[PDB]
Design an enzyme around this catalytic site. Sequence first.
Site, PDB file in Angstrom:
ATOM      1  N   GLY A  15     -19.537  -8.947  50.900  1.00 19.87           N
ATOM      2  CA  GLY A  15     -20.653  -8.202  51.440  1.00 19.87           C
ATOM      3  C   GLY A  15     -21.796  -8.110  50.463  1.00 19.87           C
ATOM      4  O   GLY A  15     -21.682  -8.500  49.297  1.00 19.87           O
ATOM      5  N   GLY A  16     -22.906  -7.600  50.955  1.00 26.18           N
ATOM      6  CA  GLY A  16     -24.105  -7.447  50.155  1.00 26.18           C
ATOM      7  C   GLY A  16     -25.193  -6.713  50.902  1.00 26.18           C
ATOM      8  O   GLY A  16     -25.199  -6.657  52.136  1.00 26.18           O
ATOM      9  N   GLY A  17     -26.107  -6.159  50.130  1.00 26.06           N
ATOM     10  CA  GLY A  17     -27.255  -5.410  50.615  1.00 26.06           C
ATOM     11  C   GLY A  17     -28.083  -4.901  49.454  1.00 26.06           C
ATOM     12  O   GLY A  17     -27.934  -5.377  48.319  1.00 26.06           O
ATOM     13  N   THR A  18     -28.953  -3.912  49.713  1.00 20.48           N
ATOM     14  CA  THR A  18     -29.772  -3.327  48.649  1.00 20.48           C
ATOM     15  C   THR A  18     -28.911  -2.621  47.579  1.00 20.48           C
ATOM     16  O   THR A  18     -29.332  -2.515  46.424  1.00 20.48           O
ATOM     17  CB  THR A  18     -30.788  -2.375  49.242  1.00 20.48           C
ATOM     18  OG1 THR A  18     -30.081  -1.297  49.853  1.00 20.48           O
ATOM     19  CG2 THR A  18     -31.686  -3.059  50.253  1.00 20.48           C
ATOM     20  N   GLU A  45     -23.629  -6.090  45.529  1.00 22.22           N
ATOM     21  CA  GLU A  45     -22.749  -7.042  46.178  1.00 22.22           C
ATOM     22  C   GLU A  45     -21.282  -6.668  46.035  1.00 22.22           C
ATOM     23  O   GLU A  45     -20.885  -6.085  45.037  1.00 22.22           O
ATOM     24  CB  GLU A  45     -22.967  -8.448  45.586  1.00 22.22           C
ATOM     25  CG  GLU A  45     -24.391  -8.955  45.716  1.00 22.22           C
ATOM     26  CD  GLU A  45     -24.661 -10.244  44.968  1.00 22.22           C
ATOM     27  OE1 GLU A  45     -25.468 -10.219  44.009  1.00 22.22           O
ATOM     28  OE2 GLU A  45     -24.067 -11.280  45.345  1.00 22.22           O
ATOM     29  N   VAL A  46     -20.474  -7.046  47.017  1.00 21.48           N
ATOM     30  CA  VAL A  46     -19.039  -6.835  46.968  1.00 21.48           C
ATOM     31  C   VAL A  46     -18.396  -8.210  46.933  1.00 21.48           C
ATOM     32  O   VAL A  46     -18.781  -9.088  47.698  1.00 21.48           O
ATOM     33  CB  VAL A  46     -18.516  -6.002  48.166  1.00 21.48           C
ATOM     34  CG1 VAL A  46     -17.002  -5.820  48.078  1.00 21.48           C
ATOM     35  CG2 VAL A  46     -19.216  -4.649  48.244  1.00 21.48           C
ATOM     36  N   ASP A  65     -22.524   8.293  58.653  1.00 19.38           N
ATOM     37  CA  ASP A  65     -22.685   6.843  58.770  1.00 19.38           C
ATOM     38  C   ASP A  65     -21.486   6.200  59.518  1.00 19.38           C
ATOM     39  O   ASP A  65     -21.101   5.071  59.227  1.00 19.38           O
ATOM     40  CB  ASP A  65     -22.873   6.275  57.335  1.00 19.38           C
ATOM     41  CG  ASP A  65     -23.524   4.923  57.231  1.00 19.38           C
ATOM     42  OD1 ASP A  65     -24.382   4.608  58.082  1.00 19.38           O
ATOM     43  OD2 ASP A  65     -23.166   4.164  56.301  1.00 19.38           O
TER      44      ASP A  65
END
EC number: 2.7.11.1
Lengths: 295, 284
Positions: free
Chosen positions: B14-17, B20-21, B127
């Site tokens: 995964g990844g985003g702001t 990263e995972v 969330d």
Amino acid sequence: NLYFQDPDIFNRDPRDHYDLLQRLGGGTYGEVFKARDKVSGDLVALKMVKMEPDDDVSTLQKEILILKTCRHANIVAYHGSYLWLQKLWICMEFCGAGSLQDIYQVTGSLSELQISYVCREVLQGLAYLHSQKKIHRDIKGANILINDAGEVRLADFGISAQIGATLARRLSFIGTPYWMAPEVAAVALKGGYNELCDIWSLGITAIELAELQPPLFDVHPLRVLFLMTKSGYQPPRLKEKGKWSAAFHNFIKVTLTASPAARPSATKMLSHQLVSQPGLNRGLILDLLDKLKNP
Amino acid sequence: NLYFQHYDLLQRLGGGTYGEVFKARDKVSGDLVALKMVKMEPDDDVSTLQKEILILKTCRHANIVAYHGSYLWLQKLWICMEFCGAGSLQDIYQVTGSLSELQISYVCREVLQGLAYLHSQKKIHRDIKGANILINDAGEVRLADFGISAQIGATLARRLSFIGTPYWMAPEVAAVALKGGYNELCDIWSLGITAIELAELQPPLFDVHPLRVLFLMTKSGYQPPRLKEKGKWSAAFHNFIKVTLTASPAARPSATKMLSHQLVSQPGLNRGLILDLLDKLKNP
Ligand SMILES: Cn1cc(Nc2ncc(C3=CCC[C@@H](NC(=O)c4ccccc4)C3)nc2C(N)=O)cn1
Ligand SMILES: Cn1cc(Nc2ncc(C3=CCC[C@@H](NC(=O)c4ccccc4)C3)nc2C(N)=O)cn1
């Protein structure tokens, strides 16, 4: 409710009623023009907002109804709206001198009495907005307008006056709403829960008018935000000491209270010596406007 | 308070702001872990790092991705956590199609156990949705994190990106700790919407413009959504949706009360239901 104190939108080109004069400004909010009424000769400002082809008319009418019912002497007066060729045009009161930022970039720092009059007038607008369960959330020098008579007007009423690109950006911050409970959606639409954020912003604005920049303007924005999350956080203050009265230092101290539980309301701030003192009137701002023309 | 309760990078998960995972393998035993690589803030100090590590270490439950440890390396904070090989329920249902009523019942029971724990610690997740519920190779259900309070860095960056400069912003609008306007019961509503999402592949109103949805949900007589295909679902599932989607939060049931509902207290709810769902991925 008619007990609290005519078409919502005209499907017509505003040029049928107004002669478009100079472009006053532009940005994320759209474009603003000075204009003159063809019949009365009265001056107005017209804001042109680009609409998306798929923007629904139902939601647009709800938004315009909010503009129609939110009125105060210290907020730019709304006159009407026109929808023509995918452009929404908002007709409003003309403020000839522009924003306080447009002015201080030429004149330099405002006097303590000029700042006191601006703060009093903004607080009267905020006391009204907070009484209507609205939050402005964008009090700053660029968003406070001055007319040729030296009067102070908030450019708009903030969060609930957003349309077009500014509102699209706020919706991106909110993110997808499909999993929000109704009470969460209510906070998201209102732009927050605690209206006392406006009192803090007014304190920062008083420093901005005194110093020509808000505190920490030169620090990277993400660092300013992170520093506010830390337990050791200290609010900003006026840079100089003897240039300002003890009443002005106290006004900054109480408005810039980090904890909103200890920060005063807009109506309580209106009782503070800085803004309740005699001699605060538009004449102070006419002196600032005269400095602008004859430096 | 103690009285209460190296690696080889394999592939990007995964990844985003936030950062990263990565999937990782321990060189000694071959055990699989997930490693989250986070950029620390320029003003992060010993006390700020200590408080965030303490929250990771102490906010712990079987139904929340387990924190194993953390270290500083290559100017990044690395968080070692439990590996959930199947990804999120959204990653899965986009391939398999809708979940069965029993599969949704097991997922809801598992998420409610996680929420009853978070709410007992005075945390609001805020969330809950299919994309934030992870599944491991054994069919077990884990909340990806403990909610918005585990996303402070990302929320600050999102605020800069879409709202603007912060010089006039009050500190409470960024610190976002005790939020007003709502309480933990907003998570029960989100779980009810997630149950519809798992049943129908989308939340209700997924095709309606966000602004229009905000106006619709805030109108006085707002009618909560329902499952659209009546004959496909039991009366217990329809009732679970009706009570989780109670419009007034004063009347909406708590996570612990929801765990007593017939839908999630029925026998036969186990990870085999999710292994059946993962078997649909091998042969779709
Ligand atoms: C340089 N200069 C600029 C000006 N004058 C203005 N400049 C900018 C603007 C605005 C910009 C963005 C917000 C807009 N307000 C609204 O759209 C609104 C108002 C009330 C209710 C709901 C919405 C006002 N207005 C003027 C002006 N009214 O005279 C003179 N000189
Ligand atoms: C497609 N795919 C995705 C996965 N697997 C994961 N994908 C995404 C993520 C996460 C993403 C962002 C949040 C992060 N959680 C935390 O940072 C956190 C956890 C506990 C307490 C406080 C914070 C978990 N984890 C996995 C996994 N652990 O296995 C397999 N396949």
